[PDB]
Amino acid sequence: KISGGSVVEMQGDEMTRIIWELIKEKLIFPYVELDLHSYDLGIENRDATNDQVTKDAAEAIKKHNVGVKCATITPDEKRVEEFKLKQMWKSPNGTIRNILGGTVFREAIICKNIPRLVSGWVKPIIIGQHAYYRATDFVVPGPGKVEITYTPSDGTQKVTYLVHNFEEGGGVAMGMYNQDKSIEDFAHSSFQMALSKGWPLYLSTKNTILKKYDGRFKDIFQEIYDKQYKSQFEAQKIWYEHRLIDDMVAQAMKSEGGFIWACKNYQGYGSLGMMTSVLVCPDGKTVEAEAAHGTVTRHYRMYQKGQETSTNPIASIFAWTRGLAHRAKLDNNKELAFFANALEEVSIETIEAGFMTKDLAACIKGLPNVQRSDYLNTFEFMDKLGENLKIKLAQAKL
Amino acid sequence: KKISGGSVVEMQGDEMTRIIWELIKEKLIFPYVELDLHSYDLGIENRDATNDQVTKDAAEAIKKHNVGVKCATITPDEKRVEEFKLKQMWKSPNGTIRNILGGTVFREAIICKNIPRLVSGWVKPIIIGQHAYRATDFVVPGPGKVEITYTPSDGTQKVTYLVHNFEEGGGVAMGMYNQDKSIEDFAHSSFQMALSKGWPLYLSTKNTILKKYDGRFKDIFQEIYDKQYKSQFEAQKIWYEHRLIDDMVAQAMKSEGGFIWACKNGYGSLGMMTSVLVCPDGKTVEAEAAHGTVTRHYRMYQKGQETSTNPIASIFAWTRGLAHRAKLDNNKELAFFANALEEVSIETIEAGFMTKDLAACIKGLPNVQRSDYLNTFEFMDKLGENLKIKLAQAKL
Ligand SMILES: NC(=O)C1=CN([C@@H]2O[C@H](COP(=O)(O)OP(=O)(O)OC[C@H]3O[C@@H](n4cnc5c(N)ncnc54)[C@H](OP(=O)(O)O)[C@@H]3O)[C@@H](O)[C@H]2O)C=CC1
Ligand SMILES: NC(=O)C1=CN([C@@H]2O[C@H](COP(=O)(O)OP(=O)(O)OC[C@H]3O[C@@H](n4cnc5c(N)ncnc54)[C@H](OP(=O)(O)O)[C@@H]3O)[C@@H](O)[C@H]2O)C=CC1
Numbered sequence: 001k002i003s004g005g006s007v008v009e010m011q012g013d014e015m016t017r018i019i020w021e022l023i024k025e026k027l028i029f030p031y032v033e034l035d036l037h038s039y040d041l042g043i044e045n046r047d048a049t050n051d052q053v054t055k056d057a058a059e060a061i062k063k064h065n066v067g068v069k070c071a072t073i074t075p076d077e078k079r080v081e082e083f084k085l086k087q088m089w090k091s092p093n094g095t096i097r098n099i100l101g102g103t104v105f106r107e108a109i110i111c112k113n114i115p116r117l118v119s120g121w122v123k124p125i126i127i128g129q130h131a132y133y134r135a136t137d138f139v140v141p142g143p144g145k146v147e148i149t150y151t152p153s154d155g156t157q158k159v160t161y162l163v164h165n166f167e168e169g170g171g172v173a174m175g176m177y178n179q180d181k182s183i184e185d186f187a188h189s190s191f192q193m194a195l196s197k198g199w200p201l202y203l204s205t206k207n208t209i210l211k212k213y214d215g216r217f218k219d220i221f222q223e224i225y226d227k228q229y230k231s232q233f234e235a236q237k238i239w240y241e242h243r244l245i246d247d248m249v250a251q252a253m254k255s256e257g258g259f260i261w262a263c264k265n266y267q268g269y270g271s272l273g274m275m276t277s278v279l280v281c282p283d284g285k286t287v288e289a290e291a292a293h294g295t296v297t298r299h300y301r302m303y304q305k306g307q308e309t310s311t312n313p314i315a316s317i318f319a320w321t322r323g324l325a326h327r328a329k330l331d332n333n334k335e336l337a338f339f340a341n342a343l344e345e346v347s348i349e350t351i352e353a354g355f356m357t358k359d360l361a362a363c364i365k366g367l368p369n370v371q372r373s374d375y376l377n378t379f380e381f382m383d384k385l386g387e388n389l390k391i392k393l394a395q396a397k398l
Numbered sequence: 399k400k401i402s403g404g405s406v407v408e409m410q411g412d413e414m415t416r417i418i419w420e421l422i423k424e425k426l427i428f429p430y431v432e433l434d435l436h437s438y439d440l441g442i443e444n445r446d447a448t449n450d451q452v453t454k455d456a457a458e459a460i461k462k463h464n465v466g467v468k469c470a471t472i473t474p475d476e477k478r479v480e481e482f483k484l485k486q487m488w489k490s491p492n493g494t495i496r497n498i499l500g501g502t503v504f505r506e507a508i509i510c511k512n513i514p515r516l517v518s519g520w521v522k523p524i525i526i527g528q529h530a531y532r533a534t535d536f537v538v539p540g541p542g543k544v545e546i547t548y549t550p551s552d553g554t555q556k557v558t559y560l561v562h563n564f565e566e567g568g569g570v571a572m573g574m575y576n577q578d579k580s581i582e583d584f585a586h587s588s589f590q591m592a593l594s595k596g597w598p599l600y601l602s603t604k605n606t607i608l609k610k611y612d613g614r615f616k617d618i619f620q621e622i623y624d625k626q627y628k629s630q631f632e633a634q635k636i637w638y639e640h641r642l643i644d645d646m647v648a649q650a651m652k653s654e655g656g657f658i659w660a661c662k663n664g665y666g667s668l669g670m671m672t673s674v675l676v677c678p679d680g681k682t683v684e685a686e687a688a689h690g691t692v693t694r695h696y697r698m699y700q701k702g703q704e705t706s707t708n709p710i711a712s713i714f715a716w717t718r719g720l721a722h723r724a725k726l727d728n729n730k731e732l733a734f735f736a737n738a739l740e741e742v743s744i745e746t747i748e749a750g751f752m753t754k755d756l757a758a759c760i761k762g763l764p765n766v767q768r769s770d771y772l773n774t775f776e777f778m779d780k781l782g783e784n785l786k787i788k789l790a791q792a793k794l
Pocket of ligand 1: 072299
């Protein structure tokens, strides 16, 4: 077996909890031994520990640099009643993101025989937004001037901008800000992401409206690029380029994918089971990977009733491969790195060979026309993945 | 005899849409409807020659007559100023008109059974109304205080909020506002939109974060619904509900369309995107296509090259305006004609006759053959033939 090293694992809820264990038993543990720091973020354990397990897991990722998380229940009124919760606990992902900070990158796994939004997309597209509300909103009770002013610490200037003169009645108003350091982090993660995946980085803004707000982003990116990054980019045939929201969307419809897209926003096509997410810290050392979808409660309800389920494990699987990939990069572990990529290859190869779960079959043929013989159920698909994994690894040996 | 349509304000536009606009009036409207046409030429040359006076006048006419249908217009930039030697960079005509009329813009894509849509589970299009810029942004060069103050006009105590204290480094800051009247109008237009279409209404905000800012939207929407629209909504078996933006995106993706989405704050064929400005009064509306003047196709047409521009959005501007005019005047004949024009457009495409953009949505642009679509004039002639036939069969 491979010596994988230190990995922080977080267990989840409902259907993903089941798939998670299938992944560990069929795909990971037979080939990788890990110094595994496992945390049970199941809803009942989070309630029992008064959410302490969530904080402990966050600190564990901070210490060991690699975290892979299963989907978790974010409680609401119904969940509080269903589980007899003591509190409507905050989402584990919010707690973890707030402890680690960083930038989230979403990337949908592409298979040739699965329709994409843009027919021409051959390579993936990695979209990134910064994990930051810290905004001061208030009620304007009646007529009067709302103004926003800046005063430098040296007190040599004072600038006052009229936000609005309320002359008929009141309303609402707010102010919000952004620190340079937070914009710089967003850019560092974004450039390191483009270098890691070996693709070009595009930044899109709306400088035609918030000329000053978005212009600061444009400048901070260009500064960092031309300073510490331009070199590596020209080396790998990649580059950085700023785009307006229109020029960017256009360049995407005509493009073949294969680029990082940084957004200053203030999730659709392709089954949710194909979407991956990665929290990348500015330091470039810490990564937390996980599927972009949820616990799949509906499929779990079928399971509980004893009905066949067909749940896509790809996003969950790619959470492990990304985490193991980063762990291998940190440890210079060529064997683990080879495994992580082999597992990714096998998943796509199996789907592209026609073995797939119902969601993907529906994407191809349309749900009203899918037949039982068009797909595999949850356990059949995991079986096929494990079978092709064993073949692939053994064949690589020769 | 033709139908007596009444008073309509019409606004002529630029480039490709101007060509198609005239074909629409000649082939689909005028052969069947007589209008008291208040017609204004918002072509770039006429706006310049009148110093944009025509644009303001058109807005006043809509205010007076309640119904307006507008062709897409060139919004000037530096390149347009050079191309036409403009006296100056005239403001977007839509900006002038919205400023004069107020109201909320609602966007709706026209759904054809045989054109693939974003979520294949959307049977009926979804109508999205948006709010408004009005953001005072600026750069923070270095350490210092950014504060936002409220100064009452009656002399009482000034109120000051800290936005942020930049202790080291700089960044950016911005201020933003919303007047209560503005939110009330947004709600009223939205409720009227939902009643008119007979569909449910959903307001999406982030009132859990912006507790006071977005909370004001949700509160005003609810108070106006309970006092002015609850019963009417029930009398049509519809409803209004607030929803957090995340939950709303969830409900929408699993839904089959058919609802109005008001959100404070999408890639189909632009040729199928419709737009309507709905004033809160419930009387005045202005309809236009969601796309622009299609300059690229116009350059083709200028060199005598074959074009295939989609007129659907332009056609639905006319049908929505005429439908509102019919409602205002209790004009059963015009109401039917407007419905017939919309169905004939949908049916022609659903029968396999379409412009190149929709053929691309089916075969993909790389494999679109000339025999897969009609050019602009071929498609317009096909619509005319089918409209003629439908209206003949409608007598009995
Ligand atoms: N990262 C996290 O921890 C996340 C937490 N959640 C939690 O999970 C639950 C969400 O349930 P829901 O709102 O249904 O969102 P889910 O993403 O859990 O399920 C959404 C729906 O999309 C389809 N789908 C999603 N993942 C898969 C998959 N792997 N294979 C096949 N189909 C899939 C299914 O639709 P169909 O049944 O039509 O196939 C499923 O019902 C809540 O408790 C929420 O708090 C949700 C989001 C993220
Ligand atoms: N309501 C208004 O008055 C509006 C004004 N404008 C003005 O109009 C011009 C806009 O030009 P542009 O920026 O190209 O935006 P357009 O929407 O005019 O053209 C956009 C592109 O989308 C496709 N497209 C749009 N409408 C159609 C259609 N009816 N049938 C087929 N394809 C269509 C074409 O792409 P392809 O050529 O690849 O098919 C077209 O080149 C500018 O002068 C702008 O100021 C723009 C926005 C709204």
